[PDB]
């Protein structure tokens, strides 16, 4: 039948302590809801000891209220076309001060969107 | 009704001129076939002119014959559990020398394998 567009973007990434928090935009024309069917991928550098350490994992999706580190959370349980949700990463370390990061995100459907910047 | 473990693992990565081949084993109990559903991601060092240049980038599958800079294809239609097969990655700038890369690939049904290690 009819095939729909999905589409997503980043507004915005924030870092608080251990916590990414990434702004999502839903672009396209379906509604995303099935998050446990996404992909959520960030590589960072962390701080271990005070050495900058290369990390990249994936992060499973959760709706408990206290994620544990290596798991996503979500403050919706639909984003729809035209609206934007918080992301919430939960790091297993601090950030490494002013290094690079990359956060790649999977719907259910197939279309990613991936960030890059500085933490 | 029944549910069925799926599982990746990596046996071994390979790489030629600007080509990866990952040789992908099925451990779990379902086939894998539905690979336009599957993930690919691989960060590794792009030698660009001379400069190794981190690369973080999204893959696509192909059946094509010829793939594409940022493209996969793997050589069997089905991958049935206790078989293995092989992935090949189509980078767009050949490895830098002696660098560290990551590959991660996630199956349809949401399990992943992540391989670490130096091209």
Redesign the interface.
Known sequence: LEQLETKITVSSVSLTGSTLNVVLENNGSTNLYDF??F?V?V?YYANISNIST?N???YNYTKNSNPSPYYWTINTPLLAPGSQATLTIILPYPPYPNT?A?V?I?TNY?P?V?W?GSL
Do not use: N
């Open positions: 446990q069917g992909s991928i590589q290369f990249l994992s994936l690079q990359t790649v999977v197939g990613s991936i890059r």
